[PDB]
Amino acid sequence: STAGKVIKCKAAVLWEEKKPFSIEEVEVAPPKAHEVRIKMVATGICRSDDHVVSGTLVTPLPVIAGHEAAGIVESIGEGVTTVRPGDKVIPLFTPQCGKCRVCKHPEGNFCLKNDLSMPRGTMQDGTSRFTCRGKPIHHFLGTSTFSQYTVVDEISVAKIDAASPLEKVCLIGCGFSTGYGSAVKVAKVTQGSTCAVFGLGGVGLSVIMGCKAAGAARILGVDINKDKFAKAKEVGATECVNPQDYKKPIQEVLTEMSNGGVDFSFEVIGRLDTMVTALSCCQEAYGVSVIVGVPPDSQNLSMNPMLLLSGRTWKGAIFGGFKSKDSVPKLVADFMAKKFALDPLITHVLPFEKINEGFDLLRSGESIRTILTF
Amino acid sequence: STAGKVIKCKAAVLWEEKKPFSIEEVEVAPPKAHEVRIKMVATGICRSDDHVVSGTLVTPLPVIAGHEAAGIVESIGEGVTTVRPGDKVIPLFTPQCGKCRVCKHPEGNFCLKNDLSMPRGTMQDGTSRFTCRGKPIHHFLGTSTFSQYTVVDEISVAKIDAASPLEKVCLIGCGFSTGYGSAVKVAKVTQGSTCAVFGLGGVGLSVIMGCKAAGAARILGVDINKDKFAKAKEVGATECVNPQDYKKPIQEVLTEMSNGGVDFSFEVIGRLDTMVTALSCCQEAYGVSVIVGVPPDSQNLSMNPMLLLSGRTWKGAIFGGFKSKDSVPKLVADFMAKKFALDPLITHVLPFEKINEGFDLLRSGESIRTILTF
Numbered sequence A, B: 001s002t003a004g005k006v007i008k009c010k011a012a013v014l015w016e017e018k019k020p021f022s023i024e025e026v027e028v029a030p031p032k033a034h035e036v037r038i039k040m041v042a043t044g045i046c047r048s049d050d051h052v053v054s055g056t057l058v059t060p061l062p063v064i065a066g067h068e069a070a071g072i073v074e075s076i077g078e079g080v081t082t083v084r085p086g087d088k089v090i091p092l093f094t095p096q097c098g099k100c101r102v103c104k105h106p107e108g109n110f111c112l113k114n115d116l117s118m119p120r121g122t123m124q125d126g127t128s129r130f131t132c133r134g135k136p137i138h139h140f141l142g143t144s145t146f147s148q149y150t151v152v153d154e155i156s157v158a159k160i161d162a163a164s165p166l167e168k169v170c171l172i173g174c175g176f177s178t179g180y181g182s183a184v185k186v187a188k189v190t191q192g193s194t195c196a197v198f199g200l201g202g203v204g205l206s207v208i209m210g211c212k213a214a215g216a217a218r219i220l221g222v223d224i225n226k227d228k229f230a231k232a233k234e235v236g237a238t239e240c241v242n243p244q245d246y247k248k249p250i251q252e253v254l255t256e257m258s259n260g261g262v263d264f265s266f267e268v269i270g271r272l273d274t275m276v277t278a279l280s281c282c283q284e285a286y287g288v289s290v291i292v293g294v295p296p297d298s299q300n301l302s303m304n305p306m307l308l309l310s311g312r313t314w315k316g317a318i319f320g321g322f323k324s325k326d327s328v329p330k331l332v333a334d335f336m337a338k339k340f341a342l343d344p345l346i347t348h349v350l351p352f353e354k355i356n357e358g359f360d361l362l363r364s365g366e367s368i369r370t371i372l373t374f
């Protein structure tokens, strides 16, 4: 038995920015009250994880990163009612406490217990369950999935279908749900509309999936890497454009293509300039633009508010606007019911021990999602 | 018997920025095809008219300004079908051509025939109906209401109830409709919500009226001029705050007051800083902020897109999001049935000839709306 005992296991520890992950032995404490210790089965490589390495995202180091994953409950602390040992689960990088003003609001999902805004890198109780070489190691978004075992707060885990294929449904933990929800729930893309999607990575392809599902007539994919176009078309893009191909700025190109601006635009990269371009390319009177990408820490964009005064709507969202604990099990059920596909997002499957190679694939432009298997 | 003839009349011509209006004789050409010549009865002094004087709003000079008004049709050009001589009318500074993509859109109102985005200061045919001292004088937003007679395109005029009191209902031509629509139509303020309204002039008061009509539980008025607070409370503000009274920035004060941020905020001033403050003070996950104020020409704001990524919605609107020609007659009908009040906005009345004194009253902080009678 491992319950109630410290587990020694393998994890990918990030000791400092801009270095490879160190794959080594860590100690994982048993869960305290209202906590859940999970044996990880599969975890995806999201660009947000790379942002921690690059310094685009600031979070306390050293850290066990990883937030897009699925595993099986090893044990539960006192008072846990929502999962049991043996359950398949997905860690929730946006928690759902169920009690705060946001959780109580019909539209809101950015639960006040989150560790994104002001990251502490701990459990809810302000402590860490991880040590490595006798040093405490920070958590990441209350998830820390780049480890054979993690411990999460109960509000940061959802029970999912016992028959789920964990090496696919881990994508529901971030990239798929984010993209899909940003289209269907946050933008509320309409039938017959014209959409523009900036960035054709895992998250942008999921936005295309959601736009198609919502009945968009035109879905214009935008990427500087033309190698991304074929897959974008497979999942629903009607045309793809590379800004580098044009003499005019792409907002102008897109406005011309859409005969005066798009209905819905999406920034799915993480650049300040493309956030403004995506806003500008939506129709000035009734267009809607959704920011999905994570921008570099502490940088402000510059924009002319006349873009809004004419009637545009600008919004952003975390995790596709989904209330995480309510939504994740339904999304997995929908997947098992063949309501959407995940395979188009998965280009590579590697053992966990090849985590660095997985990051290199992302950074080189060659992968969409690499799934790491434990 | 003036039909088909040039009319000589008095108008308030602005020859130069930052100068008084010159009340002097102009020549008003008869209406061409699909044009309407109107004998003005009443016009309000809106801060946007002052922006033309101050150079906050750039439009070609010399100009006859004025956009919030009502009058009586003197004559119609060939092919006009929607008004007749003798009809009471309100000029529409935002046209409604009924044919463009925006007019056909269920939500949009910023008709593509507008003269706001890239002002030419002409009629739709790119010419002027006004001469003064033998020189052509520009139009303003297709309306030019600071004149005993004006000529407008058919798409820029609405027929209103023959029994309308024009000295009141002129406010439906800008300030009332803008503020009230910004709350009820653009923001979609909900029952029991908390709203913050920045700027307690004619338009901000109208926002308050709309928030109260929509059932908001708390309506927090924000102004640096505490003399504006009494009237704001009369029309439904539950609390008023002066940023100058506080050591902390007003977004922090308002967040504290609202136990974590407001449901709906409105910028109704025209400052880049208060646009960002207004966004910040809405709840980060589900808050909505609407820009109503007109910013200084060609200036960009700076903001951190994390304010949006958490879930905020930011939008702007012209004329309260109302399709102008459909909406103005209904707004008048509703006023006549006492569905809303206009008297709280009217603080001063003056003859047209005292237009400069009207502007002095606004600039001093003393007036809300001065109504000028011809």
Ligand SMILES: NC(=O)c1ccc[n+]([C@@H]2O[C@H](COP(=O)([O-])OP(=O)([O-])OC[C@H]3O[C@@H](n4cnc5c(N)[nH+]cnc54)[C@H](O)[C@@H]3O)[C@@H](O)[C@H]2O)c1
Residues within 6 Å of the ligand: A046, A047, A048, A051, A174, A175, A178, A198, A199, A200, A201, A202, A203, A204, A222, A223, A224, A225, A228, A243, A268, A269, A270, A271, A274, A291, A292, A293, A294, A295, A317, A318, A319, A320, A368
């Ligand atoms: N809001 C959320 O909850 C959320 C969730 C998941 C991902 N993210 C962010 O979303 C972004 C996309 O993540 P991902 O899909 O995993 O990343 P990714 O797989 O790197 O995809 C990004 C794509 O953007 C393309 N790109 C780069 N620069 C430009 C440019 N200038 N113009 C057009 N295309 C360009 C690039 O070629 C690549 O295909 C990242 O910033 C993530 O951090 C946010």
Ligand SMILES: NC(=O)c1ccc[n+]([C@@H]2O[C@H](COP(=O)([O-])OP(=O)([O-])OC[C@H]3O[C@@H](n4cnc5c(N)[nH+]cnc54)[C@H](O)[C@@H]3O)[C@@H](O)[C@H]2O)c1
Residues within 6 Å of the ligand: B046, B047, B048, B051, B174, B175, B178, B198, B199, B200, B201, B202, B203, B204, B222, B223, B224, B225, B228, B243, B268, B269, B270, B271, B274, B291, B292, B293, B294, B295, B317, B318, B319, B320, B368
């Ligand atoms: N979007 C539209 O269609 C539309 C329509 C009508 C008016 N406008 C604009 O809306 C704004 C308000 O017009 P109005 O009500 O006629 O003007 P106004 O009567 O000058 O009211 C503005 C109020 O803002 C207050 N104010 C000034 N600076 C600050 C500050 N730093 N903090 C808090 N309050 C401050 C000021 O004391 C005054 O009561 C102007 O910019 C107009 O140009 C836009």
Ligand SMILES: OCc1c(F)c(F)c(F)c(F)c1F
Residues within 6 Å of the ligand: A046, A048, A049, A057, A067, A093, A116, A141, A174, A294, A318, A319, B309
């Ligand atoms: O990819 C999901 C994701 C985000 F959307 C963030 F805003 C963030 F800060 C982060 F760390 C993260 F993982």
Ligand SMILES: OCc1c(F)c(F)c(F)c(F)c1F
Residues within 6 Å of the ligand: A309, B046, B047, B048, B049, B057, B067, B093, B116, B141, B174, B294, B318, B319
């Ligand atoms: O007050 C209404 C009003 C506006 F909202 C503008 F954006 C503008 F440019 C203008 F001239 C105007 F009069």
Ligand SMILES: [Zn+2]
Residues within 6 Å of the ligand: A095, A096, A097, A098, A099, A100, A101, A102, A103, A111, A112, A113
């Ligand atoms: Zn919560």
Ligand SMILES: [Zn+2]
Residues within 6 Å of the ligand: A046, A047, A048, A049, A067, A068, A174, A175
């Ligand atoms: Zn992610």
Ligand SMILES: [Zn+2]
Residues within 6 Å of the ligand: B095, B096, B097, B098, B099, B100, B101, B102, B103, B111, B112, B113
């Ligand atoms: Zn139109």
Ligand SMILES: [Zn+2]
Residues within 6 Å of the ligand: B046, B047, B048, B049, B067, B068, B174, B175
């Ligand atoms: Zn106005």
